[PDB]
């Protein structure tokens, strides 16, 4: 609905920055609405969903185990590791790391997992293999959040990310059990409150992943829908704003309000 695009443009005005947006039909893959669908934006923490998808693919293939324990030390800790920080002693399982990476956006968890699969080059290779020739991971946390203007590193495009998410959640890529696990992690996201969740009506379903980075970078990927089932994928990215975190959250939430209103 174009009324939503009105809000997206308004957000651009308010934030004084580019906003990338896409509304995708989960079932058919049809693009319902878009704004800057093919411009690059830093993925930030949204990459974690793809990372865990790759992990799950290995689990499916027998090359990885969810129960496998990973040990790390103070040395591996990076900024913002609320979960990993508390488990230095006993370590954490792959499953727990994906949970922390997705639900709490634990940066260290993500790094550990990245290493585990072979690094950014491998995640990228994984995406390429699934038909995503746009999305690329080049660095680890925290560098991947630099958001240097015009830098293609660690970026995606709203249309690419939407499409990839659709494949991950509904394609034959992962086994059903792994698909569900991924969705369950995204549904349990605990740090995305002020975003789309704030505009979500009761009884609706939401599986998401937020992210923030330098240079006013903020974004969210989500699968949502009424009556406890997802039916659309929404991707929203922004970068370049000088606005405060709260200002950025509000705009994203208002975008969500509009998309819900015009459902
Ligand atoms: C992913 O996007 C992570 N972001 C940061 O570590 C980058 C950052 C944030 C603020 C200032 C400077 C750099 C984790 N993702 C977000 C998100 O999910 O909202 C957090 C803020 C939780 S950290």
From Swiss-Prot:
PROSITE patterns: BETA_LACTAMASE_A. This protein is used as a marker in many commonly used cloning vectors, such as pBR322 and the pUC series. The active site is at residues 45, 143. It is an enzyme of class 3 (hydrolase). Changing residue 139 to H: In TEM-6 and TEM-16. Keywords: Antibiotic resistance, Disulfide bond, Hydrolase, Plasmid, Signal, Transposable element. Substrate binds at residues 209-211. SUPFAM superfamilies: beta-lactamase/transpeptidase-like. Disulfide bonds join 52-98. GO terms for biological process: beta-lactam antibiotic catabolic process; response to antibiotic. Its EC number is 3.5.2.6. Changing residue 139 to S: In TEM-5, TEM-8 and TEM-24. One of its GO terms (molecular function) is beta-lactamase activity. It catalyses: a beta-lactam + H2O = a substituted beta-amino acid. InterPro entries: Beta-lactam/transpept-like, Beta-lactam_cat, Beta-lactam_class-A, Beta-lactam_class-A_AS. The beta-lactamase present on pBR322 was cloned from plasmid R1 (R7268). The class A beta-lactamase family has a specific amino-acid numbering system, sometimes called Ambler or ABL numbering and often misspelt as Amber. A multiple sequence alignment was used to derive a consensus sequence and then the consensus was numbered taking into account insertions and deletions. This allows use of identical numbers, e.g. for active site residues, despite differences in protein length. UniProt always uses natural numbering of residues, hence there appear to be differences in numbering between this entry and some papers. TEM-type are the most prevalent beta-lactamases in enterobacteria; they hydrolyze the beta-lactam bond in susceptible beta-lactam antibiotics, thus conferring resistance to penicillins and cephalosporins. TEM-3 and TEM-4 are capable of hydrolyzing cefotaxime and ceftazidime. TEM-5 is capable of hydrolyzing ceftazidime. TEM-6 is capable of hydrolyzing ceftazidime and aztreonam. TEM-8/CAZ-2, TEM-16/CAZ-7 and TEM-24/CAZ-6 are markedly active against ceftazidime. IRT-4 shows resistance to beta-lactamase inhibitors. Belongs to the class-A beta-lactamase family. This is Beta-lactamase TEM. It comes from Escherichia coli.
């Amino acid at each position: 609905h174009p009324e939503t695009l009105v809000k997206v443009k308004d957000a651009e005005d308010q934030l004084g920055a580019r906003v990338g947006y896409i509304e995708l039909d989960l079932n058919s893959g049809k693009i319902l609405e878009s704004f800057r669908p093919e411009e690059r934006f830093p993925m930030m923490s949204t990459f974690k969903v793809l990372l865990c998808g790759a992990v799950l693919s290995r689990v499916d293939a027998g090359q990885e185990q969810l129960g496998r324990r990973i040990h790390y030390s103070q040395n591996d800790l990076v900024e913002y590791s609320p979960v990993t920080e508390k488990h230095l002693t006993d370590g954490m399982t792959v499953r727990e790391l994906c949970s922390a990476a997705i639900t709490m956006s634990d940066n260290t968890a993500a790094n550990l997992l990245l290493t585990t699969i072979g690094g950014p080059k491998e995640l990228t290779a994984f995406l390429h293999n699934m038909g995503d020739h746009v999305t690329r991971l080049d660095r680890w946390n925290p560098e991947l959040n630099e958001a240097i203007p015009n830098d293609e590193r660690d970026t995606t495009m709203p249309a690419a990310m939407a499409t990839t998410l659709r494949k991950l959640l509904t394609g034959e890529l992962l086994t059903l059990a792994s698909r569900q696990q991924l969705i369950d992690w995204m549904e349990a996201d605990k740090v995305a409150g002020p975003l789309l969740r704030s505009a979500l009506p009761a009884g609706w379903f939401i599986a998401d992943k937020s992210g923030a980075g330098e240079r006013g970078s903020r974004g969210i990927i989500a699968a949502l829908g009424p009556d406890g089932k997802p039916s659309r994928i929404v991707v929203i990215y922004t970068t370049g704003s000088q606005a405060t975190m709260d200002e950025r959250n509000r705009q994203i939430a208002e975008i969500g309000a509009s998309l819900i209103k015009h459902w």
